[PDB]
Amino acid sequence: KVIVFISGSCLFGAISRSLFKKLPIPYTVVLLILGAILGVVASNVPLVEEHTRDVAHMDPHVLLQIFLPVLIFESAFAMDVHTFMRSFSQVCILALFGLVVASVLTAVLAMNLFNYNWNFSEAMMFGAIMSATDPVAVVALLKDLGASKQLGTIIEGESLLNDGCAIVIFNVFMKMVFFPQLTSTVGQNVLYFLQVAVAGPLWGYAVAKVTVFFLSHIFNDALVEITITLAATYLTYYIGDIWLEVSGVLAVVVLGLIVNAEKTSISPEVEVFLHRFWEMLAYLANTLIFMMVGVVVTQKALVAVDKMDWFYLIILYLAITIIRGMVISLFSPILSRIGYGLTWRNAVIMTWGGLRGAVGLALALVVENLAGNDVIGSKFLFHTAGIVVLTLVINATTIQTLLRILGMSDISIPKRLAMAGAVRRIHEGQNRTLNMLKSDRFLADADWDIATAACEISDPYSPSPREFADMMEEARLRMLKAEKISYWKQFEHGMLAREALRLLVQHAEVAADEKDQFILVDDLKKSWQIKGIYPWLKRKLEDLITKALIPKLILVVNGKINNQLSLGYDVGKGYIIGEEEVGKIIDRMVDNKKILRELKHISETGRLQVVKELGLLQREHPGIAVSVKTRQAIRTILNHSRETIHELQGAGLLDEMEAHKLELTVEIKMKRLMNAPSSIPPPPPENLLKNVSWLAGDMKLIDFIKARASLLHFDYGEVIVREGDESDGLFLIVSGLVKLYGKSEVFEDYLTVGNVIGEMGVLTKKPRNATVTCETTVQVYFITAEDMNIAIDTFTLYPSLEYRLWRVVAIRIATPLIMEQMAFQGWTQEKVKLHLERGYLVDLAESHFQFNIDATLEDVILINGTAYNAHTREEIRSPCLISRTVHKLTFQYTATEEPRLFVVRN
Amino acid sequence: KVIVFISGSCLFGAISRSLFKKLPIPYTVVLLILGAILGVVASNVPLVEEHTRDVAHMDPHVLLQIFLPVLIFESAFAMDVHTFMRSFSQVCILALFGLVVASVLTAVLAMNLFNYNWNFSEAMMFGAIMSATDPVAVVALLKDLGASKQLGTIIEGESLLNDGCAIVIFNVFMKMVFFPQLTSTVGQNVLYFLQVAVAGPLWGYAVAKVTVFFLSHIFNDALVEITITLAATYLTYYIGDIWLEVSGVLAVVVLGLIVNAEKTSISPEVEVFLHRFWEMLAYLANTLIFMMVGVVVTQKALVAVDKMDWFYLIILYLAITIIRGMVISLFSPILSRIGYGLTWRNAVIMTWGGLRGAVGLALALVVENLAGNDVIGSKFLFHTAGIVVLTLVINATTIQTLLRILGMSDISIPKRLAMAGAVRRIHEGQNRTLNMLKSDRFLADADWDIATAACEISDPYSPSPREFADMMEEARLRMLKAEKISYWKQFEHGMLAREALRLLVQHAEVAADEKDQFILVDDLKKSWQIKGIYPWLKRKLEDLITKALIPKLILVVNGKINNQLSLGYDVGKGYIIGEEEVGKIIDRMVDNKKILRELKHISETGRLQVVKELGLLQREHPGIAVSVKTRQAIRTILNHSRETIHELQGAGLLDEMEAHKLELTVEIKMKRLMNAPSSIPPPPPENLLKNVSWLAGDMKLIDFIKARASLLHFDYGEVIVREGDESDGLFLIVSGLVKLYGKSEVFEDYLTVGNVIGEMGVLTKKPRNATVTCETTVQVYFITAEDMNIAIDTFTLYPSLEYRLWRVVAIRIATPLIMEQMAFQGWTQEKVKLHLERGYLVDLAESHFQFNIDATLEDVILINGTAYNAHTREEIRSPCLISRTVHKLTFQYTATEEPRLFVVRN
Ligand SMILES: Nc1ncnc2c1ncn2[C@@H]1O[C@@H]2COP(=O)(O)O[C@H]2[C@H]1O
Ligand SMILES: Nc1ncnc2c1ncn2[C@@H]1O[C@@H]2COP(=O)(O)O[C@H]2[C@H]1O
C-alpha cells in the first residue's frame, strides 16, 4: 500500500513551496527535514514503519530507468536553443575538462584522505557523484532578480553536459565494479565507448528529423501533434535503452534539443502545453526522491556517527570549491586569448554556481541499495547527503550576498527615469479620463474615494576638463537612449527582425559599457558578413563538386549562407535608419558647439562607411536585397491590416466570431510568410510599366510608351541634365539613386526609382531649372518631345491622367513650401504626404474666372498664372500662401500657360 | 508484449483523423474497418494472433474501472456549466423519462421478437445498452456548421444524464444476473438505491468545496494548482469506487461540474492546460477501444452468421428510432405548456441526434468477456456492433441532408452585408498603406505582383399595402441592426457585462424572429426583477429566522439575490442607452413620415416605462445602484489604462519586460475587481464637498461652506426658481435629476448632481433668466448673497478658483453655441468637451485693452462687455462668433460688468 505516501508527498511539497517561497533559500531543504522527521517516527510506530518499508525498499532498476531520464530530459527541454548553440563550443569544452579534472582530483584526494580500503574505482565513481549539479535553483534566482540571460544559458549548458558525462562514467564503473564477471579487453571497451559517443546522438537526430517531417503535413489540429510527439519520445527512449543503459539519455536529450529548435511546424499552444506537462512530471519526481532520500538517510546513518567523518565533510567541501575555482580561473585566460572570455563578475558568479542536486542523490540511492548490507553504502549516502545539504544553503546565501556586494543586478538611472516617465503618463491619463467620466449623468453617484484608491497604481522600481568630461558623458548617454528608443520604434512598426533587434541592442549595451565610447564598425563588419570556417568549407566543397544528396547539400548550403546575408543586410538597414534619426533629432538638445559638431561629424563618417559597404554588398548580390525588401513589405502590410481590423472591432462593427475567424486568416498568412523561401529573383524592367501609379489602368498607353521610349544608361557619378540648359526631353528613373539640386537658397535632395524627370520643361516648353546628377551606374527610359505630343494626343477624352500628372507636378513644388510653413511645424514627410493626398486640384474654368473663398478649405496654393484679388487688388507672384482674409479671387484668360491651383479641405 | 499494439493504435488513429476529416462522416468507422482487417489476418499468421491474443483478452475489471470513468469525466468536463444550469430541469426530466421508457420498450419488444430463452433481466440490460449515446460527434458537426449553442448544450446534457442512469442500471443488473448468490430483500435494495442516488453527489460536492477553498489562498503559481486538482480528482474517484462500484462516476462528474463552474480562483492557463490533458486522455481511450471491439467482433461473430438476425437488425433500428421520435413528440406539448417548449427545428434536430458511442461498446465487451463461453455474448456483441455501425453512418448522412434541406444553418443577408463592408474596409486600408509605402526610398525595388498576391485576402462567406409592408420590414431590420451595433459598442468600451450582453442580444434575436415585431418589455420585466420560487423561499426563511450557519445562510442568500438585482439594473441601463442612441441616429434614415413618427413614438413610450420602473427599483434599493456604478467606473478606467499603456508600448517608449510587468499589475487589479464584494453602502452627503472639481484643494473654504450653507429639500415635481424672478441665491445640486428651460427658441435640458444653480445671478447681481424645476424629491445646499460676498472675500490672493468658476460659467453658454456651429458639425458632447478643456479664459487687462488676432487660435468667444473692432468698427452684441478676418480688437473700461473672453488654440 503506497497511496498515502505519494499523496502526503504531494501535499507537503505544495505547502512547502507555497509557504517558504518568499525567502531566497530553495524550498527543497525543508521538506528534506520532514523526511528526517518521519524517520524519527518510522522506527517508533509499526504503522508508518509498514508503509515506509513497503515503499522505500524498491529495486534499483526502477529508479535508474525512470527517475533519471525524466530529470535529464526536463533539464534539456526548457532551454533557449539558439543562445546555447551560440556558445556551444566554449561551454562544452570547459564543462568536460572541468568535470574530468574535478573527478580525478577528488578521487586521488579521497585516496589520500580517508584511508578506506578502496580501489581507484570507488574513488572515481565517488568523484562522478560529486561532479553532478542542479541548474534549476540558480537559474530560478537569476530569473528572480539577476536580470541576466547569457549567464543562465551558460550555467545551464554546464550543468547539462556535466550530468551527461557524469552519468555515463558512473554507469560504466558501476558495471565494472559490481559485475566482475565481464572481461575488460581494450578493443571491446574502446568500441563500446565510441558507439556510446556517436550512435546515440545520430539515432536521436534521425528520429527527430523523421518525426518533424511527419508533423510538417498536419495543420489546424491539436491532438495528433501531442500524441505523435509523446509516442516518438517514448520509442526513442525504449530503443536507446534496449541497446545501451546509457545511450537512452543522450538520445532523448538530442531529441529534445532538436524538437525545441523547430518552431514553425508546431503551433504555440502545443509547445506551451508540452512545456507544462514535462515541467510537472519533473517536479513530482524531484519531490518524491527528496523525501525518499531524507527518510532513508535518517534511518540508516544513525548507526555510523563519529567525529572523524563529521570533521572531514568540511574539508571535503572546501576541497571541491577550491578545485572548481582554480580550474575555472585557469581556463579564464585561454578563453580571453581565444576571444571568448568573460568578465570578473561572470567568473566569480560561475565560481559559486555549482549546486548539487537530485541526480547525485539518485545515484547515491542506487549505489546504496545495490551494495547490499555493507558500511560502504551508508558512508556514501551520509557523505553525499551532508555535502548537498551543506552546499545548498551555504552557496545560496553566498550568492545572495555576492549579488548584493558586487551589485551587477543594480538598477540604472536611465531605466529608472524611463519608468518614472511612464508612470507619470499613466497617472495623467487616468486623471484625464476620470475627470471626463465625472461629468456623465448616471455615473455621478459613485463614491470616488474607493474608486481612486482602487484604480491607482505605483512604480515597481521605487572651461574645466571635469565639466567637459561629464557633459560629453551625459551626451553619450543621451545618444545611447536616442538610439535604443529609435530601434524599439522601428521594430514595433514592423520594420526589422527580432534576432536582428537583439543583436543590435546587445551591440548597443556593449558600446555603452566602455567609457567615452560609442558603437564601432569592426564588430559590425564581422556582424554583417562572414569570413569564417563555414564560407571557406562551403566554397571549397561547391568548387570540388549518392547522386541526389549533393544537390540537396549545395542548396541547403546556399540557404544557410543566405540567411546570414539577409540578417546582415537587415542590421545594416536598421543601424543606418537609427543613425539618421538620432542625428536629425539631437540637433537642438545641447548648445555646446564643439561636442555637437564632433559627434555629428563622427556619426556622418560612420554613415558614409556603412552605406558604402552596404552598396558594395548590394552590388555583390541584388537578389537577397529584393527578397528581404519583399519580406519587409509583406510583414508591415500584415501588421497594419491587423491593427485596422482590431480598430474595426473596437468600434463594434463586428461580432467576436468573425473577428476571430479573420484573425486566424491573418495568422495563416503570416505563418506562410515565415516559410517563404529566400528565393532571389531580380525583377525584369518591364513589370514596372504596370506598377506606375499614374500610368495605372492604361494598357494601351503602356504599350505605346514601351514602343516609344529609349533605354538609357549612365555610369558612376554622371550627369544627365544641368540647370539652365535646354530641355533634352523627359525621363523615368528606373534604376539607382540620383541627386538633384536647384533653386527653391539652393535645395538638394536624393530621389530613387519611381520618378519622372523633366516634367516641368515638357509641360511648359521651357528649359531646365535644376541640375540632376546620378550617383552611380543607372538606367532610365527617355521620351522625346514629339512622343510627348503623341502622348498628349493619346490622352483623348480622359485628361484625368493628365490631372494626376498635374497633381504630381504640384507634389514636386508644394512639399518644400509646406515644410516651410508654421501651420505644419514639426511635421514629418509621412504626415504632410497623408495630408495633401485628400486634396483636389482645381482649374479656373469651373469657377468661371471667379472663386469665392470659404472657411471649409484648410489650405490652398496656386501654381502659376495671372490671378488678381477682388478686394485687396494686390499683385502676388504665385506660388504664395497667405491668410484666409481674402474671400474672392478673379482670373483672366491666358494662352502662354494654363493657370491651376490646389486645395486641401479639412 | 503490447507495445506494437498501442503504437499502431496511435498511428492509425492519427492518420485516419488527418486524412478523412474533410468528409462529414465521423472518422471512427474507418479505423473500425482496420480492426476488422486485422481480424481476418489475425487468423492468417501466428505472430499477429499472438500479439492480439496477448492484448485482447484483458480482464473485465480493468475496462470497467478504467475506460468508463475517463470517458464520462471527459463528457462532463468540456461543458458550459451556466447554459447547463439554465436548462437543468427540463433536460434532466426529459432525459430520464426517455431513457426509462426506451429501456422498457426495447426489453418487451426483445421478448416479443427474438424468441430467445431469456429472462426479463437480459432483455432490460440489453435495452439499457442502446439507451446510451455519444454526444461528441453531433456537437462536432454543430460547431462545424450548425452555428448554434443551446442545441449543443441540451443534447450534451441529454447524453450525459442518459449515460449516468444507463451505467448505474447496467451495473446493478449485471451484479444481480451473474452473481445469483446475493439476496434481493427489498429493504437493502431501496436503501442501496437511495444512497447511490444521494451520498455520491454530496461526497463530490464536499470534496469540491474543500479543494476550491484550499486553492483560494495560492497566487501567481502554476504547478501546485495542477497537482492539487489532479490529486483531488483521484482521491475522489478512489473513495467513491471503494464505497460503491457505481458512485465513483457520479461523484467525479459532480466534481468536474463544480470545478468547471469556478473560474476566478484558477488562472486561465491552468484551465486550458487541464482541458487539453483530459481531452487527450479521452481520445486515446476512445481510439483503443474502437479498434479493440472491431477485432474482437470480426474474430467472434464469424461463427454465428445467418439471415435471421441479419434481417432483424433493421427492424430493431427502426424500432429504436420510432420510439425515440414518438416519446420526444409526446413530450413536446407539455414542455410547450409549461413554458419551456422548443420549435419544430429543435425537435427534429434532437430526433436524429442519438448516436451510439464508445460507452455501449465498452459495456458489450465487459458483458461478453464476463459471460464466458456461450452464444449469448457473441449475440450481444454482434447486435450492438451492427446497430452502432449502421446508426452512425446513417444518422450522420441524414443529419447532414436535414441541415441542408431545412437550412436553419443558412446565412442571413444582414451579416453577409456586414462581412462585405468589413472586407471593403480592410481592402481599402491595404491599398492606402501600400500606396504610402511605394513612396519610400529603400522599399522600392520590390516586385509588387507577388506582394499584392500574397497580402490580399478574401471573404469567407462568399400607396399599396405591399410596398408599405416591405418598407416597414426593412425599417424593422435597420433598427434591429442599429440596436445590435450599439450594444456591441457599449460592451466594447467597457460599460456593460458579458452575460448581460448575451442575454440582451438573445432577446434582440428572438424579437427579430417575429414578423412586424420589436423588443417587448414584459420579457424585460421578468428579466430584471424576480418573483419566482427563490424570492418567496428566501423571504419566508429570513422572516422565520448550528448557530453559526444561519448568518452564513442569510448572507449568501442576500448575495444571490443582489446578483440578480445587479444584472437587472445593468440590462436596464444598457437598453435605455441603446434605444436613446438608435432614436438619435435613425432620424434621417428615411423620409416616410408616418412610419418614422410611429416608431419614434413607441420607442419613446417604452423608454418612459423602463425609466419609470428603473426609478422605482432604484428607490427600492439605492445601495445596489451605487455598487454597480462604482464597479462600472473601475472597469472603464482599467480598460482605458490598458489601452494607453499598449499605445505607449506602440511608440517604443518601453521594453516589453516592463510592459509585461505592468500588464500583470493591471491584471491583478482587474482580478481584484472580480472578487469585489457587492457591498451596498450609500455615500454620506459630506464626501462630495471634497469631490467638487472647482472646490478641490481648498479645505478651509470647504469648511467655511459647510459652516455657511443650508440644507434644502424638495418634493416630487417641484420648482425651486423661475425665469425672470429675483435671484433667490445660489444652490448646489446634490440629489436627484432636474430639468431646466430658458432662452437660448426655448432650450430645455436635464442636469444632475455636480452642478451649481444661480451662478450668473450671483456674479452679475441680476435676476433669473431661466426656470429650474426638480423632477423628484431632491436635496441641495443653498448659499446666500452675503455668504457669496464672504466667499469672494475668502478668495483672497487666489482668484484662480474664481477663474475656474468663470470657466464653468463659460461652459454653460459656449456648448449650445458650439453645438450650433458648422465647424463642429456632427460633434458629440464628449468631442466638444475634450475640445474646449484645453482652452484658456482671457481678460482685457493683460492685453492692455487691445488684442491682436493671429491664426494660432482655433476658436474664440467673448462673453459680455464693450468691445469694438479696430478695422471693421462694427458693434457686435457678444456672444458672437465670426470669421478670423478681424485682426485687432479694442476695449474700454467698464464698471457695471467685467468683460472676459475664451480662446481655444489648436
Ligand atoms: N520641387 C521639385 N521637386 C521635384 N522635382 C523638381 C522640383 N523642381 C524641379 N524639379 C525637376 O527638375 C526639372 C528641371 O527641369 P524641368 O523644368 O524640365 O523639369 C524639372 C522637374 O522634373
Ligand atoms: N447655458 C446654460 N447652461 C447651464 N446653466 C445655465 C445656462 N444659462 C443659464 N443657466 C443657469 O440658469 C440660471 C438662471 O438664473 P441665474 O442668472 O441666477 O443663473 C443661471 C444659471 O445658473
CSV table of N, CA, C and O and ligand atoms in Angstrom, one decimal, chain B residues 721 727 729 740 743 747 749 751 756-762 764 766-772 811-816, ligand 2:
chain,number,residue,atom,x,y,z
B,721,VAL,N,-36.7,77.7,-8.6
B,721,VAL,CA,-36.6,79.1,-9.1
B,721,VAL,C,-37.4,79.1,-10.5
B,721,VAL,O,-37.6,78.1,-11.1
B,727,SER,N,-33.1,86.8,-8.0
B,727,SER,CA,-32.2,85.8,-7.7
B,727,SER,C,-32.3,85.5,-6.2
B,727,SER,O,-31.9,86.3,-5.3
B,729,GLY,N,-30.7,83.3,-4.6
B,729,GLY,CA,-29.4,82.9,-4.0
B,729,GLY,C,-28.7,82.0,-4.9
B,729,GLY,O,-28.8,82.0,-6.2
B,740,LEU,N,-34.4,72.0,-16.7
B,740,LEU,CA,-34.1,73.4,-16.8
B,740,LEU,C,-34.6,73.9,-18.2
B,740,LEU,O,-34.4,73.2,-19.2
B,743,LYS,N,-34.1,80.8,-22.3
B,743,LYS,CA,-33.9,81.4,-23.6
B,743,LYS,C,-32.5,81.2,-24.1
B,743,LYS,O,-31.6,81.4,-23.4
B,747,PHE,N,-34.6,76.6,-24.8
B,747,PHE,CA,-33.9,75.4,-24.6
B,747,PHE,C,-34.3,74.7,-23.4
B,747,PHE,O,-34.7,75.4,-22.4
B,749,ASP,N,-33.4,71.1,-20.9
B,749,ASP,CA,-32.3,70.1,-20.7
B,749,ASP,C,-32.5,69.5,-19.3
B,749,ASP,O,-33.3,70.0,-18.5
B,751,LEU,N,-30.2,68.1,-15.9
B,751,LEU,CA,-29.0,68.1,-15.3
B,751,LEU,C,-29.1,67.2,-14.0
B,751,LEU,O,-30.2,66.9,-13.6
B,756,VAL,N,-24.0,73.8,-10.1
B,756,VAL,CA,-24.3,75.0,-9.3
B,756,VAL,C,-25.5,75.7,-10.0
B,756,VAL,O,-25.6,75.7,-11.3
B,757,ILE,N,-26.3,76.3,-9.2
B,757,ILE,CA,-27.6,76.9,-9.7
B,757,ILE,C,-27.6,78.3,-9.3
B,757,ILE,O,-27.4,78.6,-8.1
B,758,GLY,N,-27.8,79.2,-10.2
B,758,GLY,CA,-27.9,80.7,-9.9
B,758,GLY,C,-26.5,81.4,-9.9
B,758,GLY,O,-26.4,82.4,-9.4
B,759,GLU,N,-25.5,80.8,-10.6
B,759,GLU,CA,-24.2,81.4,-10.7
B,759,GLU,C,-24.2,82.7,-11.4
B,759,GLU,O,-23.6,83.7,-11.0
B,760,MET,N,-24.9,82.8,-12.5
B,760,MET,CA,-25.0,84.0,-13.3
B,760,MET,C,-25.6,85.2,-12.5
B,760,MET,O,-25.1,86.3,-12.6
B,761,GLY,N,-26.7,84.9,-11.8
B,761,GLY,CA,-27.3,85.9,-11.0
B,761,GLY,C,-26.4,86.4,-9.9
B,761,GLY,O,-26.4,87.6,-9.6
B,762,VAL,N,-25.7,85.5,-9.2
B,762,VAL,CA,-24.8,86.0,-8.2
B,762,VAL,C,-23.6,86.8,-8.8
B,762,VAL,O,-23.2,87.8,-8.2
B,764,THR,N,-23.5,88.5,-11.6
B,764,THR,CA,-23.9,89.7,-12.3
B,764,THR,C,-24.9,90.6,-11.5
B,764,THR,O,-25.2,91.7,-11.9
B,766,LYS,N,-28.0,90.0,-11.0
B,766,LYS,CA,-29.1,90.1,-11.9
B,766,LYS,C,-30.2,89.1,-11.6
B,766,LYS,O,-29.8,88.0,-11.0
B,767,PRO,N,-31.4,89.3,-11.9
B,767,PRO,CA,-32.5,88.3,-11.7
B,767,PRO,C,-32.3,87.1,-12.5
B,767,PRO,O,-31.4,87.0,-13.3
B,768,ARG,N,-33.2,86.1,-12.3
B,768,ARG,CA,-33.2,84.8,-13.0
B,768,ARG,C,-33.5,85.0,-14.5
B,768,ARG,O,-34.2,85.9,-14.9
B,769,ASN,N,-32.9,84.2,-15.3
B,769,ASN,CA,-33.1,84.2,-16.8
B,769,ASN,C,-33.6,82.8,-17.3
B,769,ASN,O,-33.8,82.7,-18.5
B,770,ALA,N,-33.8,81.9,-16.4
B,770,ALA,CA,-34.3,80.6,-16.8
B,770,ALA,C,-35.0,79.9,-15.6
B,770,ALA,O,-34.8,80.3,-14.5
B,771,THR,N,-35.8,78.9,-15.9
B,771,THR,CA,-36.6,78.2,-14.9
B,771,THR,C,-36.1,76.9,-14.6
B,771,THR,O,-35.9,76.1,-15.6
B,772,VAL,N,-35.9,76.5,-13.3
B,772,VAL,CA,-35.4,75.3,-12.9
B,772,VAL,C,-36.5,74.5,-12.1
B,772,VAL,O,-37.0,75.1,-11.1
B,811,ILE,N,-18.6,77.5,-19.8
B,811,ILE,CA,-19.0,76.1,-20.2
B,811,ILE,C,-20.5,76.1,-20.3
B,811,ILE,O,-21.1,75.5,-21.3
B,812,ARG,N,-21.2,76.8,-19.5
B,812,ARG,CA,-22.7,76.9,-19.5
B,812,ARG,C,-23.2,77.4,-20.9
B,812,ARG,O,-24.2,76.9,-21.4
B,813,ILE,N,-22.5,78.4,-21.4
B,813,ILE,CA,-23.1,79.2,-22.5
B,813,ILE,C,-22.4,78.8,-23.8
B,813,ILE,O,-23.1,79.0,-24.9
B,814,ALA,N,-21.2,78.3,-23.8
B,814,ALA,CA,-20.5,78.1,-25.0
B,814,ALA,C,-21.0,76.8,-25.7
B,814,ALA,O,-21.1,76.8,-26.9
B,815,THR,N,-21.2,75.8,-24.9
B,815,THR,CA,-21.6,74.5,-25.6
B,815,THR,C,-22.8,74.5,-26.4
B,815,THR,O,-22.8,73.9,-27.5
B,816,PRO,N,-23.9,75.2,-26.0
B,816,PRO,CA,-25.0,75.3,-27.0
B,816,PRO,C,-24.6,76.1,-28.3
B,816,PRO,O,-25.1,75.8,-29.4
C,2,LIG,N1,-26.5,77.8,-21.0
C,2,LIG,C1,-26.6,77.4,-19.7
C,2,LIG,N2,-26.1,76.3,-19.2
C,2,LIG,C2,-26.3,75.9,-17.9
C,2,LIG,N3,-26.9,76.7,-17.0
C,2,LIG,C3,-27.4,77.9,-17.3
C,2,LIG,C4,-27.3,78.3,-18.7
C,2,LIG,N4,-28.0,79.5,-18.8
C,2,LIG,C5,-28.4,79.8,-17.5
C,2,LIG,N5,-28.1,78.8,-16.7
C,2,LIG,C6,-28.5,78.8,-15.2
C,2,LIG,O1,-29.8,79.3,-15.1
C,2,LIG,C7,-29.7,80.3,-14.0
C,2,LIG,C8,-30.8,81.3,-14.2
C,2,LIG,O2,-30.6,82.4,-13.2
C,2,LIG,P1,-29.2,82.9,-12.9
C,2,LIG,O3,-28.9,84.0,-13.9
C,2,LIG,O4,-29.2,83.3,-11.4
C,2,LIG,O5,-28.1,81.7,-13.1
C,2,LIG,C9,-28.4,80.9,-14.2
C,2,LIG,C10,-27.5,79.7,-14.4
C,2,LIG,O6,-27.3,79.0,-13.1
